[PDB]
Amino acid sequence: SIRLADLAQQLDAELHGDGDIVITGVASMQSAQTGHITFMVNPKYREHLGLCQASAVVMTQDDLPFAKSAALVVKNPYLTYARMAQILDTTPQPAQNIAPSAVIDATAKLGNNVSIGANAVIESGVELGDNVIIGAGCFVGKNSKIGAGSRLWANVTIYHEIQIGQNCLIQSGTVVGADGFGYANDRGNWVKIPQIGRVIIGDRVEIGACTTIDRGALDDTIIGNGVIIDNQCQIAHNVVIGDNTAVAGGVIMAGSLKIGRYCMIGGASVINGHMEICDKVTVTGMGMVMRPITEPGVYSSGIPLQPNKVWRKTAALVMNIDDMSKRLKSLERKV
Amino acid sequence: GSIRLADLAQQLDAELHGDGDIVITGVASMQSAQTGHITFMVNPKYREHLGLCQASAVVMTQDDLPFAKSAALVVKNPYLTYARMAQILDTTPQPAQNIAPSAVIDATAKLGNNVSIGANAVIESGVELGDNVIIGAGCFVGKNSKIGAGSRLWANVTIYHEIQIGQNCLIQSGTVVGADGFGYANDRGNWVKIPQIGRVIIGDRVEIGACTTIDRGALDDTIIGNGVIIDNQCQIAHNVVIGDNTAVAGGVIMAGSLKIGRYCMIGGASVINGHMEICDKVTVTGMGMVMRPITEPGVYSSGIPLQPNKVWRKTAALVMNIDDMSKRLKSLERKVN
Amino acid sequence: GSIRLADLAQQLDAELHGDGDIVITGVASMQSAQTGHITFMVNPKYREHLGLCQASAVVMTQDDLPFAKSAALVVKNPYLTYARMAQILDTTPQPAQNIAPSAVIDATAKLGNNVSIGANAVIESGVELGDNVIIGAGCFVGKNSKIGAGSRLWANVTIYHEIQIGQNCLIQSGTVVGADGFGYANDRGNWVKIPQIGRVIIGDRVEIGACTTIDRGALDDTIIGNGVIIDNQCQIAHNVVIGDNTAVAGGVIMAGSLKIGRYCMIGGASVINGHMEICDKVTVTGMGMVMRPITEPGVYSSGIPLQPNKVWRKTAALVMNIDDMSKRLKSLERKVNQQ
Amino acid sequence: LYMLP
Numbered sequence A: 001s002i003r004l005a006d007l008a009q010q011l012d013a014e015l016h017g018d019g020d021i022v023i024t025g026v027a028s029m030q031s032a033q034t035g036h037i038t039f040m041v042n043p044k045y046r047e048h049l050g051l052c053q054a055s056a057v058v059m060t061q062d063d064l065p066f067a068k069s070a071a072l073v074v075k076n077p078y079l080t081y082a083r084m085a086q087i088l089d090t091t092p093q094p095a096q097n098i099a100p101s102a103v104i105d106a107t108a109k110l111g112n113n114v115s116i117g118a119n120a121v122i123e124s125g126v127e128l129g130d131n132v133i134i135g136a137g138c139f140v141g142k143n144s145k146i147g148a149g150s151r152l153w154a155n156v157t158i159y160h161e162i163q164i165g166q167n168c169l170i171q172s173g174t175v176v177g178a179d180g181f182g183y184a185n186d187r188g189n190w191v192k193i194p195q196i197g198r199v200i201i202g203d204r205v206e207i208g209a210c211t212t213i214d215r216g217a218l219d220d221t222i223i224g225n226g227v228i229i230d231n232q233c234q235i236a237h238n239v240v241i242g243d244n245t246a247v248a249g250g251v252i253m254a255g256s257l258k259i260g261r262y263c264m265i266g267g268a269s270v271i272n273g274h275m276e277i278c279d280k281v282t283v284t285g286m287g288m289v290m291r292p293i294t295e296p297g298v299y300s301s302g303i304p305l306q307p308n309k310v311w312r313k314t315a316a317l318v319m320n321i322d323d324m325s326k327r328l329k330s331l332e333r334k335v
Numbered sequence B: 001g002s003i004r005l006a007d008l009a010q011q012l013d014a015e016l017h018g019d020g021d022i023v024i025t026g027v028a029s030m031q032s033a034q035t036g037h038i039t040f041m042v043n044p045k046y047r048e049h050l051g052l053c054q055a056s057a058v059v060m061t062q063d064d065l066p067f068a069k070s071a072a073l074v075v076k077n078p079y080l081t082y083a084r085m086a087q088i089l090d091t092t093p094q095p096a097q098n099i100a101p102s103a104v105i106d107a108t109a110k111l112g113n114n115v116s117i118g119a120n121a122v123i124e125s126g127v128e129l130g131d132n133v134i135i136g137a138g139c140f141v142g143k144n145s146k147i148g149a150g151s152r153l154w155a156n157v158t159i160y161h162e163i164q165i166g167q168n169c170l171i172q173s174g175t176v177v178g179a180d181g182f183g184y185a186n187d188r189g190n191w192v193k194i195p196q197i198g199r200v201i202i203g204d205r206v207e208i209g210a211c212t213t214i215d216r217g218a219l220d221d222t223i224i225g226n227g228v229i230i231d232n233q234c235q236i237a238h239n240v241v242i243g244d245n246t247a248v249a250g251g252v253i254m255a256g257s258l259k260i261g262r263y264c265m266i267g268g269a270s271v272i273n274g275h276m277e278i279c280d281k282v283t284v285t286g287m288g289m290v291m292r293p294i295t296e297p298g299v300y301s302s303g304i305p306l307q308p309n310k311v312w313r314k315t316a317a318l319v320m321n322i323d324d325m326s327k328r329l330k331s332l333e334r335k336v337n
Numbered sequence C: 001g002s003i004r005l006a007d008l009a010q011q012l013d014a015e016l017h018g019d020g021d022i023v024i025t026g027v028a029s030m031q032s033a034q035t036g037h038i039t040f041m042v043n044p045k046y047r048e049h050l051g052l053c054q055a056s057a058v059v060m061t062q063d064d065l066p067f068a069k070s071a072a073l074v075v076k077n078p079y080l081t082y083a084r085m086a087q088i089l090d091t092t093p094q095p096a097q098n099i100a101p102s103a104v105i106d107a108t109a110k111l112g113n114n115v116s117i118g119a120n121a122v123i124e125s126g127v128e129l130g131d132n133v134i135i136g137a138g139c140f141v142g143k144n145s146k147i148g149a150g151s152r153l154w155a156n157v158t159i160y161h162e163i164q165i166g167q168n169c170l171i172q173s174g175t176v177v178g179a180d181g182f183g184y185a186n187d188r189g190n191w192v193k194i195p196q197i198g199r200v201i202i203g204d205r206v207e208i209g210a211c212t213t214i215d216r217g218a219l220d221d222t223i224i225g226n227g228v229i230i231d232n233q234c235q236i237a238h239n240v241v242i243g244d245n246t247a248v249a250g251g252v253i254m255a256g257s258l259k260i261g262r263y264c265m266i267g268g269a270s271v272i273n274g275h276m277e278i279c280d281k282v283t284v285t286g287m288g289m290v291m292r293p294i295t296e297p298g299v300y301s302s303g304i305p306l307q308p309n310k311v312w313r314k315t316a317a318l319v320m321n322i323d324d325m326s327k328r329l330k331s332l333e334r335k336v337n338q339q
Numbered sequence D: 001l002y003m004l005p
């Protein structure tokens, strides 16, 4: 809990009203009570701000005439919200101190202020940077290194020879460094190719829950700095993702794909491998990415939902579109 | 647990035809059933095949009865009766029994009566487990989360902090409830993480399959209604609301702030956009590409299904070039007229 | 791990050209290889670039040999030889060694010889682990499940009860075998759970990736044949049957009671509907939407690929209105037919 | 946009 004026100072916001208001937390506009700061970005909310019971509303200058409570004026209310939420954050840590039920190999190297949760398992040769937090039930494989300030929630699996930078966050159920899907074929029998590459994760990487990132076959799978990856994603062996790219939930990527910087991959997209997507590409949801992308911009695919009776006719006609094309060509010829 | 046929019949509200003293030990499919097993017939085409079934008893309808070649249990709904009798005769073990010495349980956790907690599970401070809750081995239950009576977690389930789960739920292994969803402000191409401080509220009688992920809300809550069933490997994003009794099949991806009404049916592998509403009584068939709100009950579909690859190549090329086809059509229409 | 080049060539059945006393310590890519490394060339485009590769030895073909700038192992199939030599020089550690004191192992479990069980693994009553089985840290293996000799689980794998796993399987972390199938009856809108008292049966030499789910059957069993490879993020519903040597790539979803034959190849992120059969030797390309039985071998595909978003909006609007396009076409054919 | 923040 923080005095309003102290908060507006940390946020570089122009305070309009009593600076002695104690702020205890953030809340939505619909839910905010005495003690809460909230924010608005949509002008639709202006008319009913007198129904908002927040102690303070973060807004822009054009909003101030409509304010019905203390206001913090700023250029970017959404960015101010992210910042004030970090200041007022209540989220607990995955762990505090080293649990006596954790199992930690003797050759592991730990920095200052490392916390390791209950029944976590840390393998031989692991290195954990300063302020690294390892949630309960995690596994960290042989010789893997996790940089300072990084945090794993409960039940995360990190394989061997993995490298993670500083201030990364990995949610539960995720697996980093499983075998890539590499097989030779000997008269129809699959022959395992051991995957002795690694995963290199940069600094400030956030990874979601039940995501898998495979280790490379010989060289590495590479996740750039600032990358964010949502839940249920598959990142195959030897994929390379450039800095600040964001990958939404349930995206499936094949091997040896390279994605540039500042891309946005919409949920449930499918990106084929041995190809490259350049910087500043946005793929919308469910995108079927079959070919390299060489120009920045927005790309999309998919025939969207219709009433089932309509869909049946759409899909049958599309499936027979070659016949349609031939009949069009025949007709042109006759005419 | 073995049971006399007459007693089973009574518990099922079934009309017994045959020896009430037959001892039923288990449920089996019609082809696998042996002596001691009870099975069921939903398809009257098998009537002529009943003499080939080795079950000690067969659930069937009154119309099937003259065809029986065994003790029969006559019911109005053999399929529902099968579900009920499989529950009575369920061989599925519990995820744990008693409180394992290797479980790590914070002193402030409040345990109801008859709670079982499996080996190496971890229970945080402030957690409350209601009567008869079972936590499988290896689970994690985060600070101040509450799990109502009769709910059960299989092994290696992860519940984060401040999660509310109702009574008589069942969550399969690998599932994660209450992770942080995507919440970022963009600051000059750099992502600034927004803490996600809402919760997940899961109602009563909810079943969640394996490796499903349900994110907590950003400020307000993600909400699963009562009686919802959710299959494997679904993604339920921050602030999604799923209405009571809705079914979500495997592999469905939902974006944030989607609202789904009651009694919907979402077919597997569907992909559903956020910040929008699907009304009550909607069925989306498998692989549905739901970009837009659905405001009327009914059945909706998308997708162009499989063809031989040689055929597909032309289909996809013609669709991709369909604007040129359309222009040619328009200009043949002018030339003719 | 280190091996004389002459020994390695003999184990690979390769023709050695160069100094068999060279000591090889590991496999590396052509770009990364340094002294002590063996690498391989599959693309003769790199013949002129081999002077830039600093491997101690390179696997190549007889046609490649005159281009070598190192000891060479000449073989018919460099790619298969690469697989074999990477197995011989595999640096991948084992998921566990010996029996961890923090493991929790029911007194009724039966272990064969040389079993390893990692830290905090949990083994239920009635479980049987064959010789040389390895259970990684944090795994759970449910009541009465059987895991055959040589099979290995990475960390944090969940096996339910009454599961049977054959010999020399490999299962990656986060994967769940034997969860309830998605089975419910329905009493006036109320879902009524159907207990799932079938099993999962997995054959020999099956490899399963990470965060894959395989549900148990409702009465009879879910079955995975011998030599099957399944990638990450896959979903195998109750009572699916997969034939020997089939490959399933990442993110594939298979609905209940699907049967897939032998030697099939299912491309990544495909969606395969249930209560139907796919015959031997079928390839479904990535993202295939499989709605019908497949009764002939061959390659099958679906899906409209990416376009620029402005182009796509028009493609999708025209496709969604294609019934009107078809009506216009028929009307114009009538006019040209003088009817 | 579809399935994007």
Ligand SMILES: CC1(C)CC(=O)c2c(nc3nn(-c4ccccc4)c(O)c3c2-c2cccs2)C1
Pocket (backbone or CB within 6 Å): B247, B248, B249, B250, B251, B265, B266, B267, B268, B269, B283, B284, B285, B286, C182, C183, C184, C185, C253, C254, C255, C256, C271, C272, C273, C274
């Ligand atoms: C809930 C119930 C007892 C009945 C039901 O409605 C249902 C069930 N199982 C399904 N599996 N798949 C599926 C799974 C993976 C890939 C493709 C399809 C569906 O789409 C399923 C559906 C639905 C169909 C249409 C809307 S929901 C079991």
Ligand SMILES: CC1(C)CC(=O)c2c(nc3nn(-c4ccccc4)c(O)c3c2-c2cccs2)C1
Pocket (backbone or CB within 6 Å): A181, A182, A183, A184, A252, A253, A254, A255, A270, A271, A272, A273, C229, C247, C249, C250, C265, C266, C267, C268, C269, C283, C284, C285, C286
């Ligand atoms: C089994 C093998 C050694 C060879 C193989 O056939 C195969 C492999 N890896 C794949 N990754 N993806 C993929 C993954 C994610 C997104 C998109 C595509 C495929 O579709 C893959 C396929 C297949 C291609 C067509 C049918 S199966 C490795």
Ligand SMILES: [Mg+2]
Pocket (backbone or CB within 6 Å): A250, A268, B251, B269, C251, C269
């Ligand atoms: Mg998917």
Ligand SMILES: [Mg+2]
Pocket (backbone or CB within 6 Å): A101, A119, B102, B120, C102, C120
């Ligand atoms: Mg322990």
